[PDB]
Design a protein around this ligand. Structure first.
Ligand SMILES: CC(C)(COP(=O)(O)O)[C@@H](O)C(=O)NCCC(=O)NCCSC1(CC(=O)O)COC1
Ligand SMILES: CC(C)(COP(=O)(O)O)[C@@H](O)C(=O)NCCC(=O)NCCSC1(CC(=O)O)COC1
Lengths: 342, 343
């Protein structure tokens, strides 16, 4: 019944600094100041499945899991994967695993990685003989259909891949809890059309979330909008902590989404009263938002850098547009052979 | 004790466009009309994919009688653009059709997406002792800018519409006797640019053109290899599902096939398995078109609602998508639901 993290890894393209973004007029100084971002991973020619596959190779090698024991492949993403009517999950399988288990996509906007983890956990527990599952994420947020800095002001989107190997047999960390909360009444906040009617039939030029958020608040009211988002976040946090038998004071590290400083302050630092030094803030602000993969990149970072110690608890915090929230408590059991000692 | 049932199902299909009208507009030529033998395809005007999925889910949930509190998962499958980036179509389906707060997400596996979500839904319900039902939906809209319903993938004509199915552990009008999924990722490169066995090419900025990528894959990997590997996956899914249900093909009363053109179905199924078109959903699919990954649901819903399937009879669901992935399922009709015609 127990579930473990057997391996994890990332593939991040080289960073583009905020200074170089300012120089190119991709970012203004107000956004630079409000987000306090330092750099964002930006890919040149690598596409999403390629980057996911590269992360899966690292995660699988670190795990020591045989390909015959990978019983599910789930690839999560939030933006165009490059080729319509093509199966990026099958590319990840062919290149990174080389086996024949089911391989498919799971999507839940910036929460896709945790959504895939929920489905992976269920899949592994539904049959007594299953062993491990591979979860990957990958996205590429290029200039013609997406604006990395202002398509969704307050969050700077990154290119890159992440991967995690979940196992029933064992691993270096134990999953103590995972909870997902859904508040679909917020659905219309990220689309055109009436917030409570059907979606408008036209849009794919350049994502402009800011326009839709204001239209949603106008129709639903700021009071309602702020409250429901707050309530969803609180349900996921307290649900995960209660399921793990922990309180926030038992948590050593908090893996937060890689959003800008203003957003993280309002949602987490000034609400929960935690210090940034207890989170992945410094990592995320040089990385950027990796679509649905931030919890994986952040946990991988904490472990690989030795910032998390055996016996310590880690809290994964993730959120997506629907809205959907996931929180997980992960217990580090031992330092993996790939990790730096402090 | 582990058993799973179909409690409800439904579709929402926009008005049809006939092959004659397609011929007249120069969307279809006589050789394509003749090779596919399509009669019409469902075409949406202003309805978006999640809108159509939500309408189908309303019908399916109303038919099932399952309360929203017993819907413990919502999975929305699709194969083409859902209309809005960084937006959650699965949350729209939840808000409009369910009104609850269980997890809602997307599952995708090309033209096999509906059966893929069925696999994950089944695991989810079986992974915890108190779960009851799950809602599965599909929805797509294949419009002219980036897609040509008649020639983006010649030999299959793609439809607009939504489908929905309610899976339950408590009961239903049909029992899921078996469900198996087969994966051959070596065929992955057949549906993209680049190099079949290298990384994908940079972002596809044009109308979908699968014929180009299939020719490039066959040139590189060989026709003998491609045809054999595709044939082997289809045969594995078929015999796996039938063996898992304790049935042989002669025990199947009706086959729900994908809504491809006549030439593809003949080569894959009619001439291979020696089954009659009259035992399949051929007549239904040829007036509907390919509903992305919802065909098994639409075809099963058609068979049940029209009374062509009788209590005690077994039904075989057949699905395939690029990747490749294949799913087959055997479903036993337990009773005629009250919304179904008597034959
Ligand atoms: C949670 C709290 C911050 C609490 O606020 P108080 O301090 O006012 O109680 C809340 O009231 C709030 O507004 N949060 C920001 C959400 C919003 O309204 N619009 C943007 C939503 S974009 C997003 C995409 C991403 O992942 O980057 C999807 O979720 C993030
Ligand atoms: C299938 C078979 C005929 C079986 O082998 P036998 O010919 O010996 O029977 C085989 O010979 C064959 O043709 N291989 C060529 C590949 C091909 O065209 N794939 C379609 C690509 S889009 C598609 C989705 C859909 O439309 O639903 C994914 O599957 C259809």
């Amino acid at each position: 019944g127990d579930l473990y993290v057997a391996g994890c890894g990332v593939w991040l393209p080289p960073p583009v600094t905020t200074e170089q973004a300012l120089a190119a007029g991709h970012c203004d100084r107000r956004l630079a100041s409000s987000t306090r971002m330092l750099s964002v991973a930006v890919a040149d020619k690598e596409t999403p499945a390629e980057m996911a596959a590269l992360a899966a190779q690292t995660a699988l090698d670190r795990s020591g899991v045989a390909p015959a024991h990978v019983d599910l492949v789930l690839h999560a993403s939030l933006y165009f994967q490059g080729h319509h009517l093509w199966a990026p999950s099958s590319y990840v399988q062919r290149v990174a695993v080389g086996n024949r288990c089911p391989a498919m996509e799971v999507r839940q906007v910036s929460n896709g990685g945790m959504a895939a983890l929920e489905l992976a956990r269920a899949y592994l527990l539904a049959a007594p003989d299953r062993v491990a599952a591979l979860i990957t994420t990958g996205d590429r947020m290029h200039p013609p259909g997406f604006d990395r800095w202002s398509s969704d002001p307050g969050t700077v989107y990154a290119d890159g891949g992440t991967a995690l190997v979940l196992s029933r047999q064992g691993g270096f960390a134990r999953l103590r809890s995972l909870v997902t909360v859904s508040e679909p009444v917020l659905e219309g906040m990220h689309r055109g059309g009436h917030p409570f009617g059907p979606p408008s039939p036209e849009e794919q030029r350049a994502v402009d979330l800011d326009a839709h958020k204001r239209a949603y608040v106008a129709e639903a009211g700021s009071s309602f909008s702020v409250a429901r988002v707050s309530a969803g976040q609180e349900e996921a946090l307290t649900g995960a902590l209660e399921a793990a038998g922990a309180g926030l004071d038992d948590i050593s590290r908090v893996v937060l989404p890689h959003m800008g400083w203003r957003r993280l302050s309002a949602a987490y630092f000034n609400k929960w009263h935690i210090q940034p030094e207890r989170t992945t803030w410094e990592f995320g602000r040089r990385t950027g938002h990796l679509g649905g993969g931030d919890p994986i990149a952040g946990f991988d970072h904490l472990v690989g850098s030795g910032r998390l110690a055996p016996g310590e608890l880690c809290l994964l915090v993730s959120v997506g547009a629907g809205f959907s929230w996931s929180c997980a408590v992960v217990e580090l059991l031992e330092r993996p052979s790939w990790a730096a000692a402090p």
